[PDB]
Design a protein around this ligand. Sequence first.
Ligand SMILES: [Zn+2]
Ligand SMILES: [Zn+2]
Ligand SMILES: [Zn+2]
Lengths: 117, 62, 45, 55, 55, 117, 144, 247, 67
Amino acid sequence: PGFVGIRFCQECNNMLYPKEDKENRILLYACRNCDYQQEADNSCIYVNKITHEVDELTQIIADVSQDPTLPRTEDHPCQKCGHKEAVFFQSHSARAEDAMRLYYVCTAPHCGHRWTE
Amino acid sequence: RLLLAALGRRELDDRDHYGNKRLDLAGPLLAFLFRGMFKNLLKEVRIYAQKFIDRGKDFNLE
Amino acid sequence: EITPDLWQEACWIVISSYFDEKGLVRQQLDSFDEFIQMSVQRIVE
Amino acid sequence: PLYVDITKTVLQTQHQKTFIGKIPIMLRSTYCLLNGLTDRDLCELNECPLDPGGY
Amino acid sequence: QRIVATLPYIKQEVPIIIVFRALGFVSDRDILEHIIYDFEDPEMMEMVKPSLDEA
Amino acid sequence: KDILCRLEHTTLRKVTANTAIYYDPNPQSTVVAEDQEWVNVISPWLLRVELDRKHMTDRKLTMEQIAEKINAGFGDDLNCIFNDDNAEKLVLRIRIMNDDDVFLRCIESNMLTDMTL
Amino acid sequence: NNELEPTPGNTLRQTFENQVNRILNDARDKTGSSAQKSLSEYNNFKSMVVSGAKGSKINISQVIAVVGQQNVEGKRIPFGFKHRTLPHFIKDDYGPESRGFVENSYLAGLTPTEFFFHAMGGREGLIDTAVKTAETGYIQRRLI
Amino acid sequence: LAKPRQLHNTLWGMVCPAETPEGHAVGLVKNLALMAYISVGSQPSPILEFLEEWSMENLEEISPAAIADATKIFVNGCWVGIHKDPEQLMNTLRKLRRQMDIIVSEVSMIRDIREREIRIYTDAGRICRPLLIVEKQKLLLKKRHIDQLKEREYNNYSWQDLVASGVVEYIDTLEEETVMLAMTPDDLQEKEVAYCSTYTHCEIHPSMILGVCASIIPFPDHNQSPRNTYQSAMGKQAMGVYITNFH
Amino acid sequence: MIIPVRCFTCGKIVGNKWEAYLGLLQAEYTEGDALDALGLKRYCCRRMLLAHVDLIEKLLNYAPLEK
Ligand SMILES: [Zn+2]
Ligand SMILES: [Zn+2]
Ligand SMILES: [Zn+2]
């Protein structure tokens, strides 16, 4: 599935809480500070992923490729730009080092391509 | 920073890191001590001048 | 240019120059002189 | 010895070179007597040239 | 699962949102935009919601 | 290992894979649209939890036993619709009979913590 | 490349460090066995240790063959820096040299990195001795 | 409390490892290493003027949403601003630190590229040691410079003159954390089976990690660490002619 | 501060050999060869003619305050 974000009351720049409408059995994000209501786009209001399988590829930024302290490799090239040199590194985040996974970011500038073998 | 600490994406800090420890020399120490006791000296000077202005006489600096 | 075999004597004379310039009590003298040069006037101002 | 100048405005009065007190100096400092003296001058002044100082 | 603060000369644990409102930021929008820099943070949503939903 | 799993403490926190809530006022039609909605066919909102076959294989659990355990724990206030073992995914659906979804969040946090299943 | 299959009962990281410890222990034991087989029987080290006066068969191994892996708090030396034991090594490497295993003997001499690791071990032993003596004094006084 | 008096990893070249008191306080008292020097501290106002004459905007004028992409810039911990591209301004700050034109050699800068930020430290209390600067596979400490250094006391070629030349620079703890080191130019920076080939700084001499007593200790690579610690402690008891003018 | 007159192990006369050693090192011989030229065969005398430090020049560089 996917996460569901904040619905914003735009005119007073505030939060919207989902409350039910019983006249037609629908869900309506209403403001508590003022009177502003929006239809619920989806039935999911709250979701908790407990397995902690988050996209570490999106978590990792591409600026780490130019760091000299990180080791450099040439075994696997960049897929999009074809440059041979990649940087292999770990998660560096908690509750992940139980499985040490390798992430390659291409050292070629202006491509910014990262991938997992 | 607290949210990234709770998530664990950012690693926590260690009190044993000498990068995160500073080392005071005699300079900051003497400056701080002189600051405090110079404030005490100014307190003495102002209460002395206040005593003379209560007495209606001009305060003597020396 | 630089020679790996003469690098030992090169780094040793670098060490000699560094100790001849500095000494050992540089941090004590520098902290005290910095304090007595600017910090006390900064306190009184 | 340490001095300050005094600016009072009761009528502005200036009182320059007013003694506060005496502040300790460690040896071989920039205001110490043992500043710039060579080994000959220091041994004439009966102090060790090889002493580091700073205390 | 909320967030409070320990402050000098304060005997209580004051919430961060009401601290921001005492500072002047009473808007939830600029409170969120001051507590985050990259706006797309749903994990921040489920780990910040009790504090603002209390305060 | 049977005596092991009989002795060692198990919690819904360590057994769940993920959880969510979906506002489905009609019990016949749901956002998940699984077969268990037709197996079932009064809370307008439903609570859906999805388990993990790694933990069912490790603990040798029968999700009928989990369903009867949670039914005994929460009484007749909450009905649980169980996903029969047709695939890897097992879903428990929770609906309240007759305060609101914040109280539903509180009781799902409670069951996540300490049912001691 | 993640061909490692984790042992049941522990994580992949714990399994990997168990494998590393097993390999290093086996290598060090083989090294010591080879040396003590070849001590040439005219060594005063051998003669005095056979007399049982002082020292140990492993002490011949450190002084002659190899120092071996040193352990802090019952494990390898942790990443005090940013995921690295020293800035002299690259980021995210798990080599025995970079993690605290000594490849040299006392006769061969040590690199400054493993000398620092031996300093870690010696300081750990000394702090243990100090707290041991203080606490056993207090406990003996309590019992008396 | 074992941990604060335990020996930490962050002590390479700051404090000699094998010099401790032996009694009730082991590890809370340290003795300064050779290359280790303490930052004297400086005012960050010329640095902030450098930022603002340059292109790093303050936090109050910048739009809020367009802080997501940029990198934060702190000076002495407190937050100053953001900038879109820390590249080439990190290099400008490094070379200006090397030439001591406006950025001093003493003030340090750390660029966290994992989390998009950079911190400038003008403060006193930081401990640093001199280290070589190497850019390519080849070093910058040239035969001309060692020729003047050998013909010292005539040209008045100084260590400060070397720092002005920018061959070597002061490196403190956070920067040592974030930089890679080359242990030996004759052994590691030389071309062979490459380890990383991304060497940025180089140590002067490994024995310089030792201290005042460990320096007179002979063969510590052969000695045991408890013996080295004992001998380094006993060096203060080592009796001899303490001062020249003792009479 | 002064050269010992005799070898601690042997007892060979050493006191003149110090000033002679300084004369030969001013005459620019390698110090081991100059030591052999002075004729100190045993290392237990070679050590004291080799690695003796003199302090009395500094002590006399100090002024005599007891005159
Ligand atoms: Zn509103
Ligand atoms: Zn690429
Ligand atoms: Zn003799």
